[PDB]
Amino acid sequence: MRAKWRKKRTRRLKRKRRKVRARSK
Amino acid sequence: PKKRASNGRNKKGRGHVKPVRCVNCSKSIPKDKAIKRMAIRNIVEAAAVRDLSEASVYPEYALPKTYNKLHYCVSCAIHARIVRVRSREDRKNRAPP
Amino acid sequence: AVGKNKRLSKGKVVDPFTRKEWFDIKAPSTFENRNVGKTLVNKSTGLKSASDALKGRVVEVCLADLQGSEDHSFRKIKLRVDEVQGKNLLTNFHGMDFTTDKLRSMVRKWQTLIEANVTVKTSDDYVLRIFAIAFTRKQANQVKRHSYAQSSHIRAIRKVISEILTKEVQGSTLAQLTSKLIPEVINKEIENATKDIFPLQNIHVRKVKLLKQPKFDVGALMALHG
Amino acid sequence: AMNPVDHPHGGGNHQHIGKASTISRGAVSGQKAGLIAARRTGLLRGSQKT
Amino acid sequence: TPVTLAKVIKVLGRTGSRGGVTQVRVEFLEDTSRTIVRNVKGPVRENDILVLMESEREARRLR
Amino acid sequence: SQVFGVARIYASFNDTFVHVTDLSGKETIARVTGGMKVKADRDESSPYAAMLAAQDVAAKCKEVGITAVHVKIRATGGTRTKTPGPGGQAALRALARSGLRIGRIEDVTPVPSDSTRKKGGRRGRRL
RNA sequence: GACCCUUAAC
RNA sequence: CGCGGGGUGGAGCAGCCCGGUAGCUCGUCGGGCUAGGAACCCGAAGGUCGUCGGUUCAAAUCCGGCCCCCGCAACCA
RNA sequence: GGUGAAAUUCUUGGAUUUAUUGAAGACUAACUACUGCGAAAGCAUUUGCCAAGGACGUUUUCAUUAAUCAAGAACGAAAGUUAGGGGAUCGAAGAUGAUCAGAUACCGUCGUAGUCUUAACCAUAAACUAUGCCGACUAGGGAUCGGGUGGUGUUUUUUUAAUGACCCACUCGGCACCUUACGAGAAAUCAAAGUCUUUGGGUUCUGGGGGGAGUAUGGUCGCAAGGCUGAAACUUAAAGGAAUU
RNA sequence: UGACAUUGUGAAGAGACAUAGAGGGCUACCUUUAUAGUUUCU
């Protein structure tokens, strides 16, 4: 898929990982 | 591969040129890249000229014209046939037809 | 779309040409052709008093059909009604501007466009914003295609232009300026001043905007016609 | 946070105004609590041609 | 409205989606030198007489 | 002598305003648009509706006393298309044919020095 | 103006 | 174990300004489009209306029973 | 009004349209170019002020003070982020119509946030010439922007008593410009992408099959958005470039 | 919010009293005036 949106999809995934890790840290 | 040595525009030594909006679709296009055509047209469309002149209150009326610099994006220039797709060799002809 | 208006009256006439009477509108003596046309006003009804429905009115006329010469075709004069004398009213100069085709025609590529505007005050206490336009020109025998000015010619040209427009209008009445704008002697004088900078063709004076006028002074307006 | 004896907003088993807090200009004293003769309410978005 | 009678002087060419009509230049029967360009549905040819339900129309193309 | 008005043609797309005023312009007579000579919105912009509107304009003004009109034709301009619509010529053409005298045609489309911002966005109308 | 898809099966 | 609505084709709705012996949409089927699917076009079928009993002016809509879908009240010592 | 065609919408209460004292905000058209300037990003109304700069010219001066550069530093479009001012226009978000299986898309009409000043932040773009910088040399030919030089060249106040603007010839610097061209290249093509198996002028940065993956167990900067740095397991026989038909 | 009252002069097509065209699929709201006379929208 378009690399622009795969970059966006990964960034949203990274944001969720930061949030889910924050609730344990 | 690289299609044109000028990169489809006229910008060597600048970096940035201000945009102009296409007159068909209002697309933002750099001015150096637009397909500007200058329209100088008789205001009476040349088929009613005698009808207008014979109805005129002035003899030998100058019959002014309208002047408009028309800017087109590449998509609208190609679609409205302002320009056409050209062969690889004769893409290098800058001289107007 | 004659019958598609969904709603124009939820509730479910006099011809005004009968009520309107033509009035004569005329140019000052600064222009040779005096009678320039006719206007319309409703009748003299107590609520409206048609005389004051006429005073604030501007009619834009061509200098050609105001001076009887096709050489003035590209200038238009705005004439402002000033007072009414029994269906024979009389105007004063209100503003001048160029016709659209002329200004578009003078603007071409491969030359420099030099615009200069000034807001000098007429000795009659009129405040005018006068615009002048000039174009650098190809010299006879010139082989170069473009004849561009060097942006310091342009500053010097604008400077000598603005000094001319300031000096001429500051020291002349509003009527006198209109009578000197007709023979285009302002354009000629600029040609001589900028001849030592750049050849500078097409040195016309475009729009003459009136910004504010003095107290009406009914004698001054009657001075033109008497 | 008051009792109904003290304020039009007072009382309730939750802290809440209960009626609209926009009050008419023709309201009388004791009633003019809240947003008096408010032309609008809510977060101001855009401009007001000022 | 009194209709007008007209005679063709030139034929421009077929036009339309399927070329079923033709541009023709046409001269008025009375007060000549008044040119007009009309679209004809059927087969037409030089020096043919054209009837116009209205006169002061000029359709330069048809697409 | 002559009694003059101003034809004041406004030819947009989907509408053309042929409507005559007096010399001052503050008194309108026969404001007729091609939108009330056709039934469909799509069929307005055609030169036919403009000529029909102009035909009715000269009729309503030859009965008022306006023998001649100066022409002030105008496209939408401003930020919009800036070119006259299909009915501009026909409206002008039908005025002169109507027995009405004409003089001093001008194109007075409003042109900005540096407009505000065009509609359609930066990628334009994509269709 | 609208117009999506296409064998596992030598 | 009180008070209320509702049940009509496979599915969703029309008899609620008291009556066209049941109609409209989706679904299904047939044909046509297309090199088969779809989308599209043209046609067809489908429920005596939850069941039983009451006036007999086309009565079953509106009446009284059982079943089913649900909904609200189920407190103050 | 709007469109492919419509519809949403505005119109007694007068919409749209016509025409001089009008409150705003933004933008600087046309001139405007194979033109100019800047380190890039970028920069286009006038005038005033303020410092700066390249090129040219110099029989001025100093005298190797230089080139390129880990670390380190300034600037850095747009979008975005705190904060007061402005908010005209257009308009991520947010409701009608076509598609119908939709259309929370493309098209209409609106419309919030969003392009000015900050302690201000952010530091990224196909930030592109996808070509690091400095230096030398190697073919042709015209044009143009600056600046100089030479032609009693042509034309110009008070007409042939300061000059300017043009024309030819040079020259320095710059933006560029006509070829599958000696040479180079996989070719496209290249005034450098040549002087490279006949391999070395100086120097910085980067890459080593595709994917996983620019994905952190980490660190650091940032208000945040995120930036910078940056794997492995595992899995693949290709992925890819330029031509040809 | 309206009326009246402390509210002191004039002007304007005074919804003015009897004999009057049209625009509408001779016919009682729509610029009107010839014949004494206190009032307008404001």
What do these coordinates show?
With 25 residues, chain A is an all-alpha fold. Chain A contains one helix and no strands. With 226 residues, chain C is α+β, with helices and mostly antiparallel strands. Chain C has helices at residues 16-19, 52-55, 64-67, 100-106, 153-169, 174-181, 185-193, 218-225; strands at 21-26, 35-41, 58-62, 75-83, 90-98, 113-118, 127-135, 205-212. Chain C contains eight helices and eight strands; from the N terminus they run αββαβαββαββαααβα. Chain F has one domain (1-127). Chain F has two helices and six strands; from the N terminus they run ββββαβαβ. A three-stranded parallel beta sheet of chain F has the order 1-5-6, covered by helices on one side. In chain F, strands 2-3-4 form a three-stranded antiparallel beta sheet. The longest helix of chain F is centred in the middle third of the chain and has 16 residues, at 47-62. Chains in contact: B-C, B-F, C-F, E-F. Chains B and F meet through α1 and β4 of B and α2 and β6 of F. Chain C binds four RNA strands through residues 5, 7-11, 13-16, 18-19, 42-43, 45-47, 56-60, 78, 80, 94-95, 103-104, 107-117, 135-136, 138-148, 150-151, 153, 155, 158-159, 162, 192-193, 195-199, 210-213.
Number of helices of chain A: 1
Going by helix content, strand content and strand pairing, the class of chain C is alpha+beta
Principal-axis shape of chain C: globular
Shape of chain A: rod-shaped
Helix percentage of chain C: 25-40%
Pair with the biggest interface: B-F, 26 and 29 residues
Biggest sheet record of chain C: 6 strands, antiparallel
> Measured on Cα atoms, how large is the radius of gyration of chain A?
11 Å
- Count of distinct structural domains of chain C: 1
Proportion of residues in extended strands of chain C: 25-35%
- Quantity of strands of chain A, as a count: 0
Largest sheet of chain A: none
Q: Cα distance, first to last residue of chain C?
A: 56 Å
Helix content of chain A: over 70%
Structural class of chain A: mainly alpha
Summarize the helix and strand pattern of chain A as letters: H
Order of helices and strands of chain C: HEEHEHEEHEEHHHEH
- The total count of strands of chain C amounts to 8
PDB class: ribosome
Keywords: 80S ribosome, ribosome
Entry title: pre-frameshift complex of yeast 80S ribosome with eRF1 and mRNA of WNV
Chain A: Large ribosomal subunit protein eL41A
